[PDB]
Amino acid sequence: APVRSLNCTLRDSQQKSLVMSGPYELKALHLQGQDMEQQVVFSMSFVQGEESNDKIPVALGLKEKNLYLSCVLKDDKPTLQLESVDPKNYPKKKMEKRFVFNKIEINNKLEFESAQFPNWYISTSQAENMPVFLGGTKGGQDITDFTMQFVS
Ligand SMILES: CCCC(=O)Nc1nnn(CC)n1
């Protein structure tokens, strides 16, 4: 049948919100009150892939935009990018591997591992207003844990 999707927001474990920062850019910063309208709303699709109780393959598209988070090699490194797709063809159940994240539930938080690049995670910096990126370890100064908020 159709792929199933939910609208949601993400915040990192320091409660930083994610916002659009100009073309194909996402930034993490502390947000509260009126300014929270600026946060990015995701359409999280539940896609084809290897699955276990606490490890669920998803795609992360921007709500009602033909833009998806994806993992590709750039100047020879696993990187996180926003990628344009054909809006007639997405979302779909069989998303290409660069778009797939393993959503992992650990100690009441979520981590998003690249399906393409094992042990690379959606990450934020501790500093304010820095890019969201792919970080090649879930252990150090960089933040790899999130909570999800479900949206109407
Ligand atoms: C998925 C988000 C990718 C992104 O934000 N990349 C990126 N690279 N340089 N910047 C501006 C400082 N931002």
Method of determination used here: X-ray
Domain ranges, ordered by start, for the chain:
1-152
**Residue 85 and residue 96 in contact, taking contact as beta carbons nearer than 8 Å:** no
For residue 60 and ligand 1, the question of a CB distance below 6 A is answered with no
Report how far apart the first and last C-alpha atoms of the chain are (Å, whole number).
22
Pocket test for ligand 1, best of 24, 65, 123 (most atoms within 8 A of CB): 24
Handedness of CA 70, 34, 31, 45 (dihedral sign): negative
For residue 91, cis peptide bond before it (omega within 30 degrees of 0): yes
Do the strands 101-106 and 55-62 form a parallel or antiparallel pair, or are they unpaired?
A: antiparallel
- Resolution stated for this PDB structure, in Å: 1.4
CATH number, span 1-152: 2.80.10.50
How far is the CA of 134 from the CAs of 13, 37, 78, 82, 123, in angstroms? 16, 25, 7, 12, 6
Nearest Cα to Cα of residue 147 among 99, 118, 106, 117: 106
